């Protein structure tokens, strides 16, 4: 549509030029109005060109956001469509997009059949599709997680579109003001001295508003170019973890682990390093405990074996790979012990992370108690008088 | 090591491609404006207005362009690390992940993903384990003063 | 230190070895004695 209107207007301009190109001086007054009309036509042509470049910039930014998120958005949409069947166009579908779901899934599944009913899936989709898509409770939890992910994707799309809309509003404002001032200058309405006074006033306007414009440009470069996180991602800034809430071009809204709302200037964030749990691989855990220096090495080997068996017998929570080390020896009485193991998830699920860590710590405490590993204070020599 | 080398080559090529895209953009805009000026299409006053608007565009975008140029100078000229190298920044060890011209992605020892502005890294000192020689170890223990020599 | 896990495992092994060697030699640490006057 943009190129269509542009070519229409340029054809209008060239047609006007061809008709009046002939040297036919109807009247001196006619020449003045003809010059004014020509200047206005070329001014609106420049305005249309500015509109074209504006829409090109906005569309390339939208395409970058698409290459960033729309792939996962379409994947989630396809997964939701497949789940519903068992129980551009993609952009439009994404924009359009608990207990009840679990009850519906249970009703669909055959009574007294914990596993997913293959017959029901076969009647609704192909066997290969059902296998690719694939305990009723686990299926319900996965469906709830997929619904939450789709809601988060929709919120992220809305945030991106709102940021793009605000950027479009700002760019359109500057474009319109530039177009009107260009039309005024081409009409040649002001004298030289007044034009110089306007020039120095524009220089002062620049000197003043340019600091905030630089801040704004840095913020949008951080938001779009760097693009460190999406809406709903749990991120750490200056050592404190939060959750992304909004995507304003000049600020970002965060929720702390206590649900406290926070506001951060995007320019300030650009200077700081940013960490993202959602985009990170499976995260690592660490537990610290202390034991006496007199502990035999055999007990340490037994503890290592118990840790290994406990970690390998719980693959749904912990990866088999793990390490146990000694940090330092204090006064030849205390040994500092550290365990390292990786979850099957990231720190995005903070509550699940903490529950799993508590379970692992209690398990390690029980294993240490079983092995009779003890800690002791250094004996004190007292001389009476 | 071969996989890491391939990843490093891909990261370098992607950084070069982004740099090429940016340079091509500025080159194309400069070429079209040069063509317009040589065609002599605009009047003097409109040209002066365009000149002051370009001056304002410079005043605004030049801070970010300076940051970008510092970042690319740090990435290419200084070149302190490669992809997959384990480096220490501000006392914390990490692993290089990506080689963006304006940012670098790191993985901490807990596998946590981190983002650092390349301009900020340029100001800080950087340590690299991969490029370092065989490293030294140290162990501390305490004993009584009455211990015989 | 690129192989952080191997580095830490080797350091732990060395620390345990040093602990065993110190225990064999009967090298000990002691707190300073405290003088107490009853009333």
Residue numbers in the entry:
A (entry chain A): 248 to 334, 387 to 396, 432 to 468, 481 to 731
B (entry chain B): 495 to 643
C (entry chain B): 693 to 731
Q: What does the original paper state about this entry?
A:
Amongst the Arabidopsis MSL channels, MSL10 is enigmatic in that it has two separable functional modalities, regulated cell death signaling conferred by its N-terminal soluble ‘death’ domain and force-activated ion channel activity imparted by its C-terminal portion. When heterologously expressed in Xenopus oocytes, MSL10 is indeed activated by membrane stretch and displays a preference for anions. In Arabidopsis, MSL10 is primarily expressed in the shoot apex, root tips, and vascular tissues, playing a critical role in adaptation to hypo-osmotic shock and induction of programmed cell death. Analogous to DmMSL10/FLYC1, each subunit of the heptameric AtMSL10 channel is composed of a transmembrane domain (TMD) with six membrane-spanning helices (TM1-TM6) and a characteristic C-terminal cytoplasmic domain (CTD) shared by all MscS homologs.
We expressed the full-length wild-type AtMSL10 channel, consisting of 734 amino acids, in Pichia pastoris and purified the channel to homogeneity for single-particle cryo-EM analysis. The channel core, consisting of TM3-TM6 and the cytoplasmic C-terminal domain, was well resolved in the cryo-EM density map and allowed unambiguous placement of most of the side chains. However, the N-terminal ‘death’ domain (residues 1–165), part of the cytoplasmic domain between TM4 and TM5, including residues 335–386, 397–431, and 469–480, and the C-terminal end (residues 732–734), were not resolved in the reconstruction, and thus were absent in the final refined atomic model. AtMSL10 assembles as a symmetric heptamer in that the cryo-EM reconstructions without applied symmetry (C1 symmetry) and with imposed C7 symmetry are essentially identical. In contrast, reconstructions of AtMSL10 in C1 or C7 symmetry indicated that all CLDs adopt the ‘down’ configuration. To evaluate the conformational state of the wild-type AtMSL10 structure, we calculated the pore radius using program HOLE36. Strikingly, pore radius estimation indicated a wide-open central ion conduction path. In contrast, the wild-type DmMSL10/FLYC1 channel, which is the closest ortholog of AtMSL10, has a minimum radius of 3.5 Å at the equivalent hydrophobic gate. Thus, comparison of the ion-conduction pore dimensions of these channels indicates that the AtMSL10 structure likely represents an open conformation, which is remarkable because the wild-type AtMSL10 structure was determined in the absence of applied membrane tension that is required for channel activation. The open AtMSL10 structure was determined in detergent micelles that were essentially devoid of membrane lipids. Consistently, we did not observe lipid-like densities surrounding the channel.
